[PDB]
Design an enzyme around this catalytic site. Structure first.
Site, mmCIF file in Angstrom:
data_model
loop_
_atom_site.group_PDB
_atom_site.id
_atom_site.type_symbol
_atom_site.label_atom_id
_atom_site.label_comp_id
_atom_site.label_asym_id
_atom_site.label_seq_id
_atom_site.Cartn_x
_atom_site.Cartn_y
_atom_site.Cartn_z
ATOM 1 N N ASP A 1 -12.037 -10.533 -1.063
ATOM 2 C CA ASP A 1 -13.256 -10.612 -0.279
ATOM 3 C C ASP A 1 -14.208 -9.617 -0.922
ATOM 4 O O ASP A 1 -13.800 -8.547 -1.384
ATOM 5 C CB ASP A 1 -13.060 -10.368 1.242
ATOM 6 C CG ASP A 1 -12.335 -9.080 1.577
ATOM 7 O OD1 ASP A 1 -12.478 -8.072 0.860
ATOM 8 O OD2 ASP A 1 -11.632 -9.079 2.608
ATOM 9 N N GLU B 1 0.760 -1.253 0.000
ATOM 10 C CA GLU B 1 0.000 0.000 0.000
ATOM 11 C C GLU B 1 0.793 1.307 0.000
ATOM 12 O O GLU B 1 0.574 2.170 0.846
ATOM 13 C CB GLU B 1 -0.956 -0.039 1.200
ATOM 14 C CG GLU B 1 -1.707 -1.367 1.284
ATOM 15 C CD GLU B 1 -2.572 -1.531 2.529
ATOM 16 O OE1 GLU B 1 -2.529 -0.668 3.431
ATOM 17 O OE2 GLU B 1 -3.296 -2.548 2.602
ATOM 18 N N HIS C 1 -10.209 -5.971 -2.394
ATOM 19 C CA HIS C 1 -11.172 -5.818 -1.313
ATOM 20 C C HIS C 1 -12.332 -5.059 -1.932
ATOM 21 O O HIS C 1 -12.392 -3.833 -1.871
ATOM 22 C CB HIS C 1 -10.570 -5.025 -0.152
ATOM 23 C CG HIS C 1 -9.571 -5.802 0.642
ATOM 24 N ND1 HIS C 1 -9.892 -6.974 1.292
ATOM 25 C CD2 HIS C 1 -8.250 -5.600 0.860
ATOM 26 C CE1 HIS C 1 -8.811 -7.462 1.874
ATOM 27 N NE2 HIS C 1 -7.801 -6.647 1.627
ATOM 28 N N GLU D 1 -5.885 -10.631 -1.526
ATOM 29 C CA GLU D 1 -6.701 -10.536 -0.319
ATOM 30 C C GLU D 1 -8.164 -10.397 -0.689
ATOM 31 O O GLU D 1 -8.869 -9.523 -0.187
ATOM 32 C CB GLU D 1 -6.250 -9.320 0.493
ATOM 33 C CG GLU D 1 -4.771 -9.344 0.847
ATOM 34 C CD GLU D 1 -4.321 -8.108 1.607
ATOM 35 O OE1 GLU D 1 -5.167 -7.467 2.270
ATOM 36 O OE2 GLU D 1 -3.114 -7.786 1.548
ATOM 37 N N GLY E 1 -39.748 -39.658 -4.227
ATOM 38 C CA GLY E 1 -39.384 -39.783 -5.624
ATOM 39 C C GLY E 1 -40.562 -39.516 -6.540
ATOM 40 O O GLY E 1 -40.466 -39.699 -7.752
ATOM 41 N N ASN F 1 2.181 -5.011 -3.470
ATOM 42 C CA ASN F 1 0.787 -5.295 -3.131
ATOM 43 C C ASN F 1 0.030 -4.023 -2.744
ATOM 44 O O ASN F 1 0.569 -3.163 -2.058
ATOM 45 C CB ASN F 1 0.768 -6.314 -1.981
ATOM 46 C CG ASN F 1 -0.597 -6.921 -1.752
ATOM 47 O OD1 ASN F 1 -1.198 -7.497 -2.661
ATOM 48 N ND2 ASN F 1 -1.092 -6.810 -0.526
HETATM 49 O O1 LIG Z 1 -37.864 -38.767 -2.075
HETATM 50 C C1 LIG Z 1 -36.919 -39.264 -1.139
HETATM 51 C C2 LIG Z 1 -35.851 -40.065 -1.862
HETATM 52 O O2 LIG Z 1 -35.182 -39.241 -2.805
HETATM 53 C C3 LIG Z 1 -34.849 -40.599 -0.837
HETATM 54 O O3 LIG Z 1 -33.895 -41.373 -1.475
HETATM 55 O O4 LIG Z 1 -35.528 -41.432 0.126
HETATM 56 C C4 LIG Z 1 -36.561 -40.706 0.846
HETATM 57 C C5 LIG Z 1 -37.604 -40.178 -0.143
HETATM 58 O O5 LIG Z 1 -38.615 -39.463 0.552
HETATM 59 O O1 LIG Z 2 -6.657 -8.662 11.024
HETATM 60 C C1 LIG Z 2 -6.523 -7.585 10.106
HETATM 61 C C2 LIG Z 2 -5.968 -8.107 8.792
HETATM 62 O O2 LIG Z 2 -6.870 -9.054 8.237
HETATM 63 C C3 LIG Z 2 -5.796 -6.934 7.823
HETATM 64 O O3 LIG Z 2 -5.237 -7.382 6.638
HETATM 65 O O4 LIG Z 2 -4.900 -5.954 8.392
HETATM 66 C C4 LIG Z 2 -5.395 -5.422 9.648
HETATM 67 C C5 LIG Z 2 -5.552 -6.555 10.661
HETATM 68 O O5 LIG Z 2 -6.055 -6.034 11.885
#
Ligand SMILES: O[C@@H]1[C@@H](O)[C@H](O)OC[C@H]1O
Ligand SMILES: O[C@@H]1[C@@H](O)[C@H](O)OC[C@H]1O
Ligand SMILES: O[C@@H]1[C@@H](O)[C@H](O)OC[C@H]1O
Ligand SMILES: O[C@@H]1[C@@H](O)[C@H](O)OC[C@H]1O
Ligand SMILES: O[C@@H]1[C@@H](O)[C@H](O)OC[C@H]1O
Ligand SMILES: O[C@@H]1[C@@H](O)[C@H](O)OC[C@H]1O
Lengths: 436, 436
Positions: A238, A128, A207, A236, A412, A170
């Site tokens: 997310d 950074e 991020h 990283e 079924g 990075n």
């Molecule tokens: O539909 C269901 C079937 O897929 C499973 O294998 O056995 C229970 C049944 O109710």
């Molecule tokens: O846990 C945190 C970490 O995931 C982040 O990358 O940097 C700050 C830290 O507090």
């Protein structure tokens, strides 16, 4: 393989890693998931400046080694994170400036890389270094004040300390090409390559959130950098909300660029996330796979040759040919769904959302009133519960996130009126479906 | 008055209450909400059998009186909870049976009611005496084994103990008119009224979730019991997911029955809930009002003049006469919304969901990228964050749940292209909207 993220990524010569927190390694649920799904590990905090050199000249690798040792024992490579950074600097470093800081930065790099010499795949040498004010210039930090050449020095220092490690720059908010910050980093990496500064990779933290949303031009950004003669890696990852589409999109961007080494999501379970409030990871607190997990896995496996419906659409069961139907287009919560002859109707129009919901009428959700076999599958007001989230497996099965059970046609049955329930997945035809 | 739930309910001679946990009365954030919004209180645990008679004959009303006093001092009446119950009985009572237990029950009723004689508006004399097995019969407990007439005895004792208190029979899963349990309680109360058994009300816990969903016939249930000559009360309301429409529906059900004394939600904030994981209340943990809160308040105040939009509709700015429009019908996350001449187009069709979202295109959500003034209002993948939750105030303003800020047409602009931002609510025309 094609059942775990790591193995799936390996099918394209890539890795799929996570950020490991040493304090969570004693948690069986945590380690079970982490060891199984990833082949690359990054220490979430254990290899940062404050943790590796708590006092000037006094190195400590206990925390770092706990993560490292666990990674190797479980057959994972390791990304070192991070050597030079304005954040999480121990107090003694925060007090430094000028030449004193410059030499401390160099000494830190040598000490940490020396300890891990030849054991690290990638090192985020500098982290950074660019401003987030929106301009594209360098972040104003004690490191930047030692001189604009500090990044170059950090990299040259790193190359000599461990020539076997890939040296990465990075940063975050450098994924959208139109952003000034992205371009500032490009210019620096370009300059480095042109003058011979040692740099092998650029890490894109990734991020993503509504403040810095993922954008399709991320692929051009990766290509642009790749063209500089450096590898690129999503370091990283997310996504706020964990949109299944966004997660697949990011995955496909990396698979589209041959230089994209791999993808590391920043954490295992949402509860382990530094931003748990954004539930941005692939597994929830229960340790169960989220809708996004299946999307990432399917993407890694190449995706499907069947373009998923865009808005609305029926869900036909292969075993009955009939469609998932809400009895008499009812809008009453608690109404168990059934299999009925497909036909243009709102009570048969299901929209699979990025959050993993199967919506009908626009605001009613396929809902599971329980987690065990025989559980009644119904419609209920959408609220985001895991009993309302579903995973669409490539084999046609639809698994409930909370229960880990498959949508099953009672007994079924294939005739009209056959109720839908949850039941251990069997690969049966009464549990396989198709979108149309 | 009509800015708080209690005041809005009082307009129709009703009350809006909550369950108070004595330990939380020491927390400002808790009491600020509790003292302001409710005019009826139920001790969540302080007035139960175990809490009032730890040992037979040895009554402890400290905790109960603390809740009672706080209630009265802050202008709230009190519901006594609860006198006769199979669950949570003190260890000593649990070991009793036959006539010995019968005498214990009677004695407890006299002790507690005597102490609070003339100060309790309603007493849940008997609680959860019916089974959930579907037989519609009495649940088998030590109390029931004393003789089927135990409930009747409990009520006769209660009447004599305190003639000024309304005596209620309280239970859950008795909201759906078609359930056996509901019919069970109905027949008992019918029999009681016909024989002159002293019972004045039936309390419907109203714990709605996927397992026991709210059904519109709940109004029929209330009306039917009302026709028996007894008052009805929603005593422990909480809705899994806090659906706005469901919260408003229950409210209107009570407003539709002259005998419905009021509504009590089981807790103040979601974090105070016995079922926090279901975020079933009207306030978030940070004390912010949820979309459901505004839905309840608007319902208590008599709702709007014209029937609310049934999903999918335009949102027009009062000052501009133009509609909330997503530029070029873009679906790209991060696109800032604007004002634009109203016309039939999907990029102008917003759906207000029960979760409080404003959806467009089916899976994109009106999203705030921040919490301060000037924050950009855009579209982002729907995931459920509070920055995607909105409250539709009766004055036409739309407030973000997370920020507490109002949708604002930048600079009061009225022309096409005017951008939308978050800004301190001002009652300005550029902050008022109508859905038509
Ligand atoms: O539909 C269901 C079937 O897929 C499973 O294998 O056995 C229970 C049944 O109710
Ligand atoms: O846990 C945190 C970490 O995931 C982040 O990358 O940097 C700050 C830290 O507090
Ligand atoms: O929901 C079903 C409806 O779609 C069909 O047309 O008639 C039977 C109903 O149960
Ligand atoms: O009697 C009840 C039945 O009507 C309902 O459908 O399921 C629960 C039972 O207790
Ligand atoms: O979104 C707007 C669209 O609705 C209108 O038709 O043309 C101008 C666009 O900006
Ligand atoms: O739109 C805003 C307006 O409502 C407020 O009054 O002044 C600042 C503007 O940005």
């Amino acid at each position: 393989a094609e059942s775990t993220l790591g193995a799936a990524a390996a099918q394209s010569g890539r890795y799929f890693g996570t950020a490991i927190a040493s304090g969570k390694l004693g948690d069986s649920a945590y380690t079970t998931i982490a060891s199984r799904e990833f082949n690359m590990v990054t220490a979430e905090n254990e290899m940062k400046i404050d943790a590796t050199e708590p006092q000037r000249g006094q190195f400590n690798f206990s925390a770092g080694d706990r993560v490292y040792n666990w990674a190797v024992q479980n057959g994972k490579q390791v990304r070192g994170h991070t050597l030079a950074w304005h954040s999480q600097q121990p107090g003694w470093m925060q007090s430094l400036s000028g030449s004193t800081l410059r030499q401390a930065m160099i000494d830190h790099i040598n000490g940490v890389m020396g300890h891990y010499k030849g054991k690290i795949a990638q090192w985020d040498v500098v982290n950074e270094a660019f401003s987030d004010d929106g301009s594209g210039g360098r972040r104003d930090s004690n490191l930047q004040r030692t001189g604009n050449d500090w990044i170059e020095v950090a990299f040259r220092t790193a190359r000599a300390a461990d020539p076997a490690a890939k040296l990465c720059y990075n940063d975050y908010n450098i994924e959208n090409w139109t952003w000034a910050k992205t371009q500032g980093v490009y210019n620096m990496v370009r300059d480095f390559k042109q003058r011979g500064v040692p740099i092998d990779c650029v890490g894109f933290q990734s991020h993503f959130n509504s403040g810095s949303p993922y954008n399709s031009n991320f692929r051009t950004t990766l290509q642009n950098f790749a063209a500089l003669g450096v590898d690129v890696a999503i370091t990283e990852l997310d996504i706020q909300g964990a949109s299944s589409s966004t997660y697949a999109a990011v995955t496909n961007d990396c698979l589209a660029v041959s230089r994209c080494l791999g993808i590391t999501v920043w954490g295992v379970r949402d509860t382990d996330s530094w931003r748990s409030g954004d539930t941005p990871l692939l597994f929830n607190g229960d340790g169960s796979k989220k809708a996004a997990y299946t999307a990432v896995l399917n993407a890694l496996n190449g995706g499907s040759s069947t373009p998923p419906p865009s808005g609305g659409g029926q869900i036909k069961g292969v075993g009955s040919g009939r469609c998932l139907d809400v009895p008499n287009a009812s809008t009453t919560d608690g109404t168990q769904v059934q299999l009925y002859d497909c036909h243009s109707a709102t009570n048969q129009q299901w929209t699979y959302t990025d959050a993993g919901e199967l919506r009908v009428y626009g605001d009613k959700c396929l809902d599971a009133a329980g987690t065990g076999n025989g559980t009644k599958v119904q419609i209920y007001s959408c609220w985001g519960g895991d009993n309302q989230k579903w995973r669409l497996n490539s084999d046609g099965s639809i698994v409930g996130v909370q229960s880990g059970l498959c949508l099953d046609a009672v007994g079924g049955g294939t005739a009209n009126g056959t109720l839908i329930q949850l039941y251990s997945c069997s690969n049966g035809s009464n549990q396989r479906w198709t979108r149309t």
